[PDB]
């Protein structure tokens, strides 16, 4: 019996400040796939909400102490009721928060420029001339830091041996791929969005893993199962199909 606090962070095309000449306030400041998703969920489940951006602007990772940051920490501390963002469902996080069923499936892949002999993650691990990395304190960095596969634990050694290999956010990683000889380990959903608007970048290889995005809630929250039921309803109504195609404009790349 009160409006739910929704934590999130800005990232194209999921959550962005809507462009306008007038000054906007409240939830109307935001647009994007995740904003449309929250609006549909709020209508089905019938709740009011307030969008708040996570202060540290991080998704969530654990330090060497076991403490969380980013949106994950907001849920653990019960400072937010829902986390509506491209929040990756991982087994590790399931022990600290609850996830709905996934509303989007994805995988880790590689962002790099076109016209190159590189075709796999193993090609990056076999050399040191081409730098590579990932976003700091994200599920992608966590995947390489926790991996027990020889190739990935070697790539993680290379990522953690260079100070600027791990970037603060997507924009820094994208710009580094453009200005330097650098490949970015990034989730396939954003790669699709970028390669559709930058014809000089492409996805290298396929998906290194397979996972999904889910709505995060504090552990034991009753809204988790309700959000799952709402997500399934949106799938059945083909509304998640429309939403992706609305915000993934298309490849104008010949
Ligand atoms: C959609 N973006 C692209 C992207 C994201 N994250 C955060 C991750 N979803 C999480 O929940 O921590 C990454 O770790 N690597 C990426 O390339 C979110
Ligand atoms: Cl995992
Ligand atoms: Cl696009
Ligand atoms: Zn697509």
UniProtKB/Swiss-Prot annotation:
Glycans are attached at residues 1, 200. GO terms for cellular component: axon; cochlear hair cell ribbon synapse; dendrite; dendrite cytoplasm; glutamatergic synapse; kainate selective glutamate receptor complex; perikaryon; plasma membrane. Expressed in the olfactory bulb (at protein level). Expressed in the deep cortical layers, dentate gyrus, reticular thalamic nucleus, mammillary bodies, pons, and cerebellum of the adult. One of its GO terms (biological process) is G protein-coupled glutamate receptor signaling pathway. Keywords: Cell membrane, Disulfide bond, Glycoprotein, Ion channel, Ion transport, Isopeptide bond, Ligand-gated ion channel, Membrane, Phosphoprotein, Postsynaptic cell membrane, Receptor, Signal, Synapse, Transmembrane, Transmembrane helix, Transport, Ubl conjugation. Coiled coil: none annotated. The keyword Transmembrane helix applies. Residues 117-254 are extracellular. It is found in: Cell membrane; Postsynaptic cell membrane. GO terms for molecular function: adenylate cyclase inhibiting G protein-coupled glutamate receptor activity; glutamate receptor activity; glutamate-gated calcium ion channel activity; glutamate-gated receptor activity; kainate selective glutamate receptor activity; ligand-gated monoatomic ion channel activity involved in regulation of presynaptic membrane potential; transmitter-gated monoatomic ion channel activity involved in regulation of postsynaptic membrane potential. Mass spectrometry data suggest the protein is N-glycosylated at five distinct sites. L-glutamate binds at residues 86, 88, 93, 139-140, 187. Homotetramer, and heterotetramer with GRIK4 or GRIK5. Can form functional heteromeric receptors with GRIK2. Interacts with PRKCABP. Interacts with NETO2. The postsynaptic actions of Glu are mediated by a variety of receptors that are named according to their selective agonists. This receptor binds domoate > kainate >> L-glutamate = quisqualate >> AMPA = NMDA. Ionotropic glutamate receptor that functions as a cation-permeable ligand-gated ion channel, gated by L-glutamate and the glutamatergic agonist kainic acid. Binding of the excitatory neurotransmitter L-glutamate induces a conformation change, leading to the opening of the cation channel, and thereby converts the chemical signal to an electrical impulse. The receptor then desensitizes rapidly and enters a transient inactive state, characterized by the presence of bound agonist. Belongs to the glutamate-gated ion channel (TC 1.A.10.1) family. GRIK3 subfamily. This is Glutamate receptor ionotropic, kainate 3. It comes from Rattus norvegicus.
